[PDB]
Amino acid sequence: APRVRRSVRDLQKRYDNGEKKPLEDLVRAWVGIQALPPSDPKSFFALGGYHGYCNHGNVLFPTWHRMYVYKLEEALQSIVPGVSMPFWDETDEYTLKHGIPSILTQEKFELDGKQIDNPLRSFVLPVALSDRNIYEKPKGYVTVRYPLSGLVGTPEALEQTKIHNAKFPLPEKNTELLNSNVRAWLKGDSPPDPTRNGVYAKYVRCLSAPNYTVFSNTTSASVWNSSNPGLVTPVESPHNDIHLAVGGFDYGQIAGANGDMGENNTAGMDPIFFFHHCNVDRMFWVWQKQTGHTDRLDIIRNYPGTNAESLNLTTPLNPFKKASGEAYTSEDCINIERQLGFTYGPGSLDDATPELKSLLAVPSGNSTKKLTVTGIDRAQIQGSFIMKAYASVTDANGKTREYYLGHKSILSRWNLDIVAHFPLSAMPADDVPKAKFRVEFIHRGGGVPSAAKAAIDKVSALQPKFEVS
Ligand SMILES: [Cu+2]
Ligand SMILES: [Cu+2]
Ligand SMILES: [O]
Numbered sequence: 001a002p003r004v005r006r007s008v009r010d011l012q013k014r015y016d017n018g019e020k021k022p023l024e025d026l027v028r029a030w031v032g033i034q035a036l037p038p039s040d041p042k043s044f045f046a047l048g049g050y051h052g053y054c055n056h057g058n059v060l061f062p063t064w065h066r067m068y069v070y071k072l073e074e075a076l077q078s079i080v081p082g083v084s085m086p087f088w089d090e091t092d093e094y095t096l097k098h099g100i101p102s103i104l105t106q107e108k109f110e111l112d113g114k115q116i117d118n119p120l121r122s123f124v125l126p127v128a129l130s131d132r133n134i135y136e137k138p139k140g141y142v143t144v145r146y147p148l149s150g151l152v153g154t155p156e157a158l159e160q161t162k163i164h165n166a167k168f169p170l171p172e173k174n175t176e177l178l179n180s181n182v183r184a185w186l187k188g189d190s191p192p193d194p195t196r197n198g199v200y201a202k203y204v205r206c207l208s209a210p211n212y213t214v215f216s217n218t219t220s221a222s223v224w225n226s227s228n229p230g231l232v233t234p235v236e237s238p239h240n241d242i243h244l245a246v247g248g249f250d251y252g253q254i255a256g257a258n259g260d261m262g263e264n265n266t267a268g269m270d271p272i273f274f275f276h277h278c279n280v281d282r283m284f285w286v287w288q289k290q291t292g293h294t295d296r297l298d299i300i301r302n303y304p305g306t307n308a309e310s311l312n313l314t315t316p317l318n319p320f321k322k323a324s325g326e327a328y329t330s331e332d333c334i335n336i337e338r339q340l341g342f343t344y345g346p347g348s349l350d351d352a353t354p355e356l357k358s359l360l361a362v363p364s365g366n367s368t369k370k371l372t373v374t375g376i377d378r379a380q381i382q383g384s385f386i387m388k389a390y391a392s393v394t395d396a397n398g399k400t401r402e403y404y405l406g407h408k409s410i411l412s413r414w415n416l417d418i419v420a421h422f423p424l425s426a427m428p429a430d431d432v433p434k435a436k437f438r439v440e441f442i443h444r445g446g447g448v449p450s451a452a453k454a455a456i457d458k459v460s461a462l463q464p465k466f467e468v469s
Contacts, residue, residue, distance in 0.1 A: 370468070
């Protein structure tokens with residue numbers, strides 16, 4: 001009898017009908033896990049801190065994160081027995097039309113007699129995150145989302161942060177703009193009417209991934225895309241996009257809202273990290289269901305994405321441990337029903353419908369070909385950034401049509417050749433040989449005004465090379 005992870009809007013539909021305990025239990029557990037001292041390995045602090053070990057851009061991204069959510073849920077169970085971590089369904093109809101379920105964004109919550117602060121909205125750091133640096137965080141820091149900023153590690157950063165946050169004083173309004181930035185990412189244009197370019201399409205496409213390796217991560221998917229016709233999309237890509245939106249990037253040059261979800265430094269101290277990751281693991285389980293890999297996953301030997309030591313299904317996923325003291329491995333969490341005792345409830349995109357081929361279709365007239373972008377060294381850009389691609393055609397008589405080709409989100413950190421691929425399905429096949437390509441970068445611009453000039457100038461010297469197939 002596996003437990004059932006349900007959508008959070010499901011637990012909310014139960015609250016709206018007077019059945020309160022499901023939501024209340026969950027909140028109670030989160031109040032629980034956030035209150036444990038920092039030395040407790042089940043504390044929210046300890047748990048979120050593990051991620052600042054983790055695996056991105058490699059074939060353990062999905063199973064490392066599967067086990068990660070499972071430990072958060074173990075720790076919640078040490079407080080309220082039998083509780084399940086709900087998923088934020090980011091491709092459901094409510095989110096396309098209204099964005100984030102309000103239980104994740106509400107200021108307060110009715111628990112026992114008491115109106116308490118919502119523990120799903122933010123976390124207050126019990127101790128500081130420092131070394132002895134703009135990404136560092138003082139005790140008492142409260143996590144923040146778009147449109148606010150949380151860069152507070154230097155006098156300069158904190159002052160610029162205050163000047164930034166004082167433009168957005170009303171929580172009700174901040175929440176509206178957040179919901180509005182989330183729906184725009186999802187749609188891929190001005191806000192359901194989804195387009196081929198948004199996060200919705202990227203999620204739909206990753207379920208078509210041909211093997212686990214190119215599904216698992218953006219390193220493998222990018223090399224596969226350099227070397228196979230068509231476009232494959234790793235689950236990691238849309239996962240990164242949700243990080244940037246909550247974490248401070250608009251869809252519609254510098255992103256000055258520096259929220260915790262926007263960078264790998266403290267993404268894990270925001271509780272929404274786990275609602276989102278709980279839904280990424282669900283996409284992963286859905287992709288296993290739909291391709292028949294509920295018990296067997298394969299890793300292509302020597303493939304890019306399979307190295308840090310080769311990375312294989314026996315590779316430990318530190319720091320997670322079985323009660324033996326043995327580390328978990330990817331072998332230990334392929335089948336979530338058999339090996340971990342849980343399953344997902346109903347949610348968006350679990351069925352392979354014909355509607356979800358019409359979206360990804362090359363419209364009649366338009367090109368089946370693909371644009372590859374190279375010669376980008378990201379090693380010197382700091383923080384996360386978005387590559388937006390475009391084609392402009394100059395006509396027979398001086399008329400320019402502009403063609404938006406899509407986006408690529410690089411989720412990164414504050415402290416390496418990058419290859420992007422874009423379909424040309426937005427443009428009519430004729431015009432492609434007659435097209436001048438380019439990429440706009442949206443980026444953190446040093447984060448503080450004292451590094452803006454250096455970061456903007458490294459961006460302006462980028463030398464991207466173009467290639468149609
Ligand atoms: Cu991560
Ligand atoms: Cu993540
Ligand atoms: O992540």
